Structures are given as structure tokens and as C-alpha cells.
């Protein structure tokens, strides 16, 4: 099985213990890293932080622990507009200034592959994509005839439905990437004024949004549109996300005015890493959404969907079940990397308990 762990550039700045260099990152914890993001500019990839360049030297650094480690520059991501990949994509001349740029950059590096993080294709974009895909494929394929081990291509997919017919050909794209990584943690409407789970794997009891928003539709979806399970890699998110109860309820369908507070390191309303839910536990009650699968809990007027343990746990038994080709994490800095905050004295809680299922049999 693959074990895909981002590491996010952003996360070096966060105060305190909050801080994370990839040189917190356990070389054999994964299977491959995914260094989130690289920029495009002039058309060509480029490095996005001021110090990218000694960062990517970090990371690469834990192959001298782990040669076997694998690892890959993720180009795009939400602040890089999906417009600009529409744009380069769109057109023959700009596509190819953009593959040849790719593989000497990687080189000069250490990577060991490209991950496309396109957030998102649309429907003007799916033919473009799948143009873009097969192209690059094929400039990895003939770089590697200068004897290094050819460059792995990997994509970042939508887990949503809607989003997956509206942007993506995922026979045609299935056909030439390495791997896919889908996003299967996205799945509550920034339109709801209730709470609600982002990353259930089954359907709830009542009044969901779609039979469609949840982890199994979307692997079983991509599975009939012919993404081989040898290709498809299961998200599983280190982080929760958090909402202000508009009242008193806190089970299902309870109102909210809005997202939650900010956690003290991540800085950003409406999201917790695990080692931020960790603390906030100490007071809280726990529930867990029987038929989901996942677990949340409440404080005060807060309110956190999240993955622990036994919910990660549960979600590797279940991509091995259904012979996916692994697991996706995001993101390292987001798990419990210090080991300090679960009370376990263990670094990465969340990716090690996805790690030690896969090895189980
Ligand atoms: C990720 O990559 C993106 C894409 O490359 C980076 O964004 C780019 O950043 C550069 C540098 O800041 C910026 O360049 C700008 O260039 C203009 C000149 O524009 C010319 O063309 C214009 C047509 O639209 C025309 O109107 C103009 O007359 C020019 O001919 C600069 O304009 C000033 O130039 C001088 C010197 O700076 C000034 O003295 C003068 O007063 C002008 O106002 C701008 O100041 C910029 O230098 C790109 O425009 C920008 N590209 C996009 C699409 O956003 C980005 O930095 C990178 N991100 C990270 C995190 O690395």
C-alpha cells in the first residue's frame, strides 16, 4: 500500500510548537511526501516560499535515512487561482513551456515527482486537463531515457460528485497518472447553517445533503468511472473543522452562526489541527455519528468535526477492503508531529495508526 503525506510550506510560521520544518517529518512514518506548493510563473514551476529552496533540501535530506522514500512538489493549491491553471492549460504553447519546465526543476531538487493540485477544473477545463495530463506523462516518459528513474505524476482530485462530472475525465486521466489522491474530507456545504461532518465515510441517518457526500460514494463513484483501484488512494485529513452553535443543541442538525474560533496555532476560523482538537478535548463531550463512522465533540458554543484514532483506523481497514492503492494524508504539519499534545508521547498519532493498519494482515 502507498502512504501519501503532505507537508505544507505555510506551516514553518506558525507560533510556538505550532511551527513545522520537514525535518519533524519520521523518513519511514510514509511512502512518499508531497511538498505543498510550488508556484507557476512565466509559465514555468517555480518555488513559492523565500527559503523553498533549503526547505526542499530538508525534505530530501530524509532519504539519507530512508533512500526508499519517495517525494513529490504539488503545484497549485487554493492560493494559486484555478484561473491560472485554466490558463496555461488551455493553450498548447503555454502547456508545453510549463511540461518542459517541470522535469529539470525536479531534478535540480531532489523530487522525485510532480502531484497536480488543481483546485478545481471546470467544465471548460476537463478536455484541458486530460491534455495536460497525458502530456506531461509523456515528457517524464522520454526524460527518463537520460537513465534516472522516471518522474511519477500524481493528481489531487474533488471527492464531490458534482465536481467530479463538472471537471474531470477520469478514464482518460486514470490512464496516465501514478496515483490519485482523493479529496474525501470536503464534504460539508459552506452553505449549511447546521453542524455536519466533513469527511464521513457512509451516509447519515437523516436530511443529508447527498447519498452523495460522503467517502464511500465517492470511491465507488470513481471506481465505476473506471479509475482502476490500483490507482485510487483514499484522503484522510489530520485536521477537523469547527462551527459556532447558533443554540443550546449540539447533535444532528443543531443551527450554527458561522464557523468556529480560530485554534490558538493555525490561525484560521473554521479549522483545527488534531493536535489543536487534542487540547480542546480536555472538558469536551465526545459523540460519534454511528452510521458515518466519524467522531465530533463540543465545548462552550463550539462545536468540532474530526478524525481520531479509531476513525483513521477505520477508514485504512476500509480503502484495503475495497483494494484501493493506499492512503492520503493531509497534512503532516497537522497531525500530532510533536507527539506532545495527544498524551500518548507518540509522534503522528493519526498517520501511524493509517501506517500500522495498511501493514496489517
Ligand atoms: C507566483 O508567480 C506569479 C506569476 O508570476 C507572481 O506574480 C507576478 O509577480 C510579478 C512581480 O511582482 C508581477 O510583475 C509585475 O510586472 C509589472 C509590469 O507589467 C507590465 O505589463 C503590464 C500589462 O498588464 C503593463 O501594464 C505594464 O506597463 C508593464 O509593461 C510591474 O509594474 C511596475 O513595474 C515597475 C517595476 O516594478 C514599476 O516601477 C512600475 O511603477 C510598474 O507599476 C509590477 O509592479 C510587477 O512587477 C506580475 O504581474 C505577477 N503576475 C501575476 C499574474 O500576478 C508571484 O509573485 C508568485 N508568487 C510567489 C509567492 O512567489
Known amino acids: 500500500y502507498k502512504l501519501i503525506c503532505y507537508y505544507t510550506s505555510w506551516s514553518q510560521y506558525r507560533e510556538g510548537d505550532g511551527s513545522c520544518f520537514p525535518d519533524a517529518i519520521d523518513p519511514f512514518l510514509c511512502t512518499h511526501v508531497i511538498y505543498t506548493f510550488a508556484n507557476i510563473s512565466n509559465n514555468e514551476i517555480d518555488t513559492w516560499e523565500w527559503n523553498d529552496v533549503t526547505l526542499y533540501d530538508t525534505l ?129 456545504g459552506a452553505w449549511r447553517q447546521t453542524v455536519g461532518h466533513h469527511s464521513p465515510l457512509f451516509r447519515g441517518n437523516e436530511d443529508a445533503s447527498s447519498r452523495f457526500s460522503n467517502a464511500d460514494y465517492a470511491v465507488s463513484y470513481m471506481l465505476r468511472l473506471g479509475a482502476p483501484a490500483n490507482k485510487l488512494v483514499m484522503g484522510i485529513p489530520t485536521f477537523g473543522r469547527s462551527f459556532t452553535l447558533a443554540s443550546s443543541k449540539t447533535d444532528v442538525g443543531a443551527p450554527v452562526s458561522g464557523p468556529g474560533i480560530p485554534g490558538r496555532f493555525t490561525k484560521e476560523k473554521g479549522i483545527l489541527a488534531y493536535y489543536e482538537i487534542c487540547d480542546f478535548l480536555h472538558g469536551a463531550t465526545t459523540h460519534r455519528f454511528r452510521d458515518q463512522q466519524v467522531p465530533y465533540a463540543t465545548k462552550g458554543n463550539q462545536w468540532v468535526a474530526y478524525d481520531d484514532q479509531e476513525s483513521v483506523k477505520n477508514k485504512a481497514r476500509y480503502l484495503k477492503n475495497r483494494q484501493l492503492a493506499g492512503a492520503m494524508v493531509w497534512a503532516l504539519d497537522l497531525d500530532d508531529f510533536r507527539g506532545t499534545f495527544c498524551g500518548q508521547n507518540l509522534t503522528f498519532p493519526l498517520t501511524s495508526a493509517v501506517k500500522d493498519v495498511l501493514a496489517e494482515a
Open 60 to 188: 530530501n535530506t530524509l532519504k539519507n535515512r530512508n533512500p526508499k522514500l519517495k517525494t513529490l512538489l504539488s503545484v497549485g493549491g487554493w492560493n494559486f487561482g484555478p484561473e491560472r491553471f485554466s490558463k496555461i492549460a488551455s493553450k498548447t504553447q503555454s502547456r508545453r513551456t510549463f511540461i518542459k519546465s517541470v522535469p529539470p526543476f525536479l531534478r535540480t531538487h531532489g523530487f522525485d515527482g510532480l502531484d497536480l493540485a488543481w483546485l478545481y477544473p471546470g467544465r471548460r477545463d476537463k478536455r484541458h486537463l486530460t491534455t495536460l495530463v497525458k502530456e506531461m506523462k509523456a515528457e517524464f516518459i522520454r526524460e527518463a531515457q537520460a537513465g534516472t528513474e522516471q518522474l511519477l505524476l500524481s493528481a489531487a482530485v474533488s471527492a464531490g460528485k458534482i465536481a467530479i462530472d463538472r471537471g474531470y475525465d477520469i478514464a482518460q486521466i486514470s490512464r496516465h497518472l501514478d496515483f490519485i489522491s482523493l479529496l474525501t474530507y470536503d464534504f460539508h
